Design a binder for this molecule. Structure first.
Ligand SMILES: OC[C@H]1O[C@H](O[C@H]2[C@H](O)[C@@H](O)[C@@H](O[C@H]3[C@H](O)[C@@H](O)[C@H](O)O[C@@H]3CO)O[C@@H]2CO)[C@H](O)[C@@H](O)[C@@H]1O
Ligand SMILES: OC[C@H]1O[C@H](O[C@H]2[C@H](O)[C@@H](O)[C@@H](O)O[C@@H]2CO)[C@H](O)[C@@H](O)[C@@H]1O
Ligand SMILES: OC[C@H]1O[C@H](O[C@H]2[C@H](O)[C@@H](O)[C@@H](O)O[C@@H]2CO)[C@H](O)[C@@H](O)[C@@H]1O
Ligand SMILES: OC[C@H]1O[C@H](O[C@H]2[C@H](O)[C@@H](O)[C@H](O)O[C@@H]2CO)[C@H](O)[C@@H](O)[C@@H]1O
Ligand SMILES: [Ca+2]
Ligand SMILES: [Ca+2]
Ligand SMILES: [Ca+2]
Length: 686
């Protein structure tokens, strides 16, 4: 099948995700609606269930609302069973309509539907070539009070009906009891509760195995992707072992939510996206888009910097899920704002790198402040809004023009209010011009592109006051006026002669797992696939066609490899780097080192005899480790994904910059558990 196929669970760069708050989209089955104080059919009280369910999504998939819009994927509220409690927060009732208060990860939320409903949703979506992404929040269960077990459902956790435990009398230690986080440090936000939500303890073997079994159930139901909740608040090491469990079983596109505020650029964020096994929601992108197109707190130079910067900071910038708003921000469109601002931001997102996500209702110009005002019931299913048409004309380009799905990004013209950028991939080009200035035209002269000579009609058909472009030889465009608020798109597509890799997924797995290599020019006959210097050809290449290769990871030593392919004739393609071959199945192990004194700015790291520990390379050591919550300085700890059942030798390092001080004596040694979790506690050897 082609890279653009709806059965491609490893690549969403050619797709356009429609984010659905299930309860606020469409009530297709009144029978499963909550009752009494937990419900409001007029959806006036935005904190109670309104009725939106899976049958409603099924209906909107079948009657063409999403299809006609160009949406090829949907991201829905967490499907697992939530608590039924109606929490009174300072006189205001609240329900689990949002689905973030899980109680049983192996059951569905009856308000959304039954298992069978979920199955029908998967079938209906797939029958219309629409992938399905589910929210999954393994960080916590639900609101709880340690010294007041009658509050809500005490954050109780069930395993397909069987009670595992609650927050009160947590003798099994299923949850954390370190208080609540103030978000002061990453460590503080990971091992303490988010608000009053019972924080699950992933170092507890029961919780670890439970969650991994849970996701498998959903993978077996046919989901095509996963949206991980508050990933900045779970041990990164455990999450990596979680992604390995997923990828070593049934890999699906996974992205986590790591909030970034205005102007925030986080190296940690980058590292997590580059090494965890999942990508992230592109907040850096979204926040900059808001500044530039919505709030007027930065200009195109800032947008350009974000694009060039993120392209350098993210190893797979193309896996980042972009958006202009969501359920935790005020709607992009302000009631008294010019609608063109939302339209331009939309056009920009749909033609930029990554995986665009559109918050339901955006195409209907929904306005609304912070939660819950941004979660109103969609007021209309009209296909006649300008925003709907914008998405309709641009979303399909991600499928037909690989330059938009996998292309590089280059600024070709710019000033305070104007940005004309170019996307390129093989014999494919797309040029996008945007003028954020709603009252001032822009005279564009000197624009140079990679577009072949000729005349190009605006793909938006002038919908956003775009214009026709005239390109001479050398790709130089002749002078033109870019209208106020003008937005235009010009493109060129043709067959690519040389093998070009535009995407690889998953990016982390053990030998034997099948990965997907997408792009153009691979040819119809099986060629060769390279993992570093290692050549793979023949039978281990399960299937091969011009835009997609399905190949099994060779039994090479664990490590980081460059992926490359060659066609039947032997012509090599570009290199897709940063692929991680695991050393085998993974288990999460907490490493603890005592009496490791340091000077300010100096931190302790972990290094060892397996790639998962950086194979003794200081620059690849795990850390910096923690020393605040679970253990206090001079004791340090860190949860790490390591190969199950392997005997591993390790040591700890004290690093400042790239300068490293090694533990003295002999290597520490231990054997990772075959499954479940583990903890190794040792002393620092001077
Ligand atoms: O590089 C692979 C090896 O990495 C580890 O070796 C560490 C030692 O653990 C560490 O003590 C340090 O050894 C130095 C030693 O302290 C000093 O007396 C001597 O003069 O120089 C040594 C360095 O050459 O640094 C090495 C890394 O170089 C790991 O313990 C080992 O098993 C790996 O084979
Ligand atoms: O002509 C090549 C040149 O094109 C663009 O430069 C623009 C510039 O961005 C505008 O602000 C204005 O000054 O017109 C210039 C073209 O005459 C590219 O930005 C630039 O890098 C490139 O060399
Ligand atoms: O907790 C984070 C913090 O840990 C280390 O700080 C130590 C410091 O090195 C010791 O000399 C002593 O002052 O205790 C501190 C922890 O309370 C890291 O050195 C520091 O960079 C890091 O932020
Ligand atoms: O009860 C606390 C809040 O829980 C949810 O908030 C979600 C948020 O929507 C999601 O994007 C983020 O990743 O996780 C948090 C907590 O799971 C509800 O949406 C809020 O209304 C609640 O106040
Ligand atoms: Ca319903
Ligand atoms: Ca947590
Ligand atoms: Ca890369």
């Amino acid at each position: 099948a082609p890279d653009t196929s709806s059965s491609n669970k490893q690549n969403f760069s050619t797709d356009v995700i429609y984010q659905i708050f299930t309860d606020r989209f469409s009530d297709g089955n009144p029978a499963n609606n909550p009752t009494g104080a937990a419900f409001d059919g007029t959806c006036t009280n935005l904190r109670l269930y309104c009725g939106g369910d899976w049958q409603g999504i099924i209906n909107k998939i079948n009657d063409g609302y999403l299809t006609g819009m160009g949406v090829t994927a949907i991201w829905i509220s967490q499907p697992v069973e939530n608590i039924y409690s109606i929490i009174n927060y300072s006189g205001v009732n609240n329900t689990a309509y949002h689905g973030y208060w899980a109680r049983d990860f192996k059951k569905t939320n009856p308000a959304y539907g039954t298992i069978a409903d979920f199955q029908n949703l998967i079938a209906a979506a797939h029958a219309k070539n629409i992938k399905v992404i589910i929210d999954f929040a393994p960080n916590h269960t639900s609101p709880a009070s340690s010294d007041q077990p009658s509050f809500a459902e005490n954050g109780r956790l069930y395993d397909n009906g069987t009670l595992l435990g609650g927050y009160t009398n947590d003798t099994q230690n299923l949850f954390h009891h370190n208080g609540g986080t103030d978000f002061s440090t990453t460590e503080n936000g990971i091992y303490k509760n988010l608000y009053d939500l019972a924080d699950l303890n992933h170092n507890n073997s029961t919780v670890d195995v439970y969650l991994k079994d849970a996701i498998k159930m959903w993978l077996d139901l046919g989901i095509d992707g996963i949206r991980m909740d508050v990933v900045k608040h779970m041990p990164f090491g455990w999450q990596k072992s979680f992604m390995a469990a997923v990828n070593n079983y049934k890999p699906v596109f996974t992205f986590g939510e790591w909030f970034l505020g205005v102007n925030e650029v986080s190296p940690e964020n980058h590292k997590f996206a580059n090494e965890s096994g999942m990508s992230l929601l592109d907040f850096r992108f979204a926040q900059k888009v808001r500044q530039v197109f919505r709030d007027n707190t930065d200009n195109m130079y800032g947008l350009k910097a974000m694009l060039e910067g993120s392209a350098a900071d993210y190893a797979q910038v193309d896996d980042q899920v972009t958006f202009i708003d969501n359920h935790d921000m005020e709607r992009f469109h302000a009631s008294n704002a010019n609608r063109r601002k939302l339209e331009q931001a939309l056009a920009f997102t749909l033609t930029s790198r990554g995986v665009p996500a559109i918050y339901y209702g955006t195409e209907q110009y929904m306005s609304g402040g912070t939660d819950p005002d941004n979660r109103a019931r969609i007021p209309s299913f009209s296909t006649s809004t300008t925003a709907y048409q914008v998405i309709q004309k641009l979303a399909p380009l991600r499928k037909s023009n690989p330059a938009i799905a996998y292309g590089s990004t280059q600024e070709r013209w710019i000033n305070n209010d104007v940005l004309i950028y170019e996307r390129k991939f093989g014999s494919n080009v797309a040029v996008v011009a945007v003028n954020r200035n709603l009252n001032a035209p822009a005279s564009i002269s000197g624009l140079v592109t990679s577009l072949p000579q000729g005349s190009y009609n605006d793909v938006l058909g002038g919908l956003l006051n775009g214009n026709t472009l005239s390109v001479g030889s050398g790709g130089a465009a002749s002078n033109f006026t870019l209208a106020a608020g003008g937005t235009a798109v010009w493109q060129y597509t043709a067959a690519t002669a040389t093998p070009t890799i535009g995407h690889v997924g998953p990016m982390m797995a053990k030998p034997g797992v099948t990965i997907t290599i997408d792009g153009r020019g691979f040819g119809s006959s099986k060629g060769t696939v390279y993992f570093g210097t290692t050549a793979v050809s023949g039978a281990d290449i399960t299937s091969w066609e011009d835009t997609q290769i399905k190949v099994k990871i060779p039994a090479v030593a664990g490590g980081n490899y460059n992926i490359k392919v060659a066609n039947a004739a032997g012509t090599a393609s570009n290199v897709y780097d940063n692929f991680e071959v695991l050393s085998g199945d993974q288990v999460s192990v907490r490493f603890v080192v005592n009496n490791a004194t340091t000077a300010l700015g100096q931190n302790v790291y972990l290094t060892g005899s397996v790639s998962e520990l950086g194979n003794w390379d200081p620059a690849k050591a795990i850390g910096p480790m923690y020393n605040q919550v679970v253990y206090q300085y001079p004791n340090w700890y860190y949860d790490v994904s390591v190969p199950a059942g392997k005997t591993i030798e390790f040591k700890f390092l004290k690093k400042q910059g790239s300068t490293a001080t090694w533990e003295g004596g002999s290597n520490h040694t231990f054997t990772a558990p075959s499954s479940g979790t583990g903890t190794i506690n040792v002393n620092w050897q001077p």
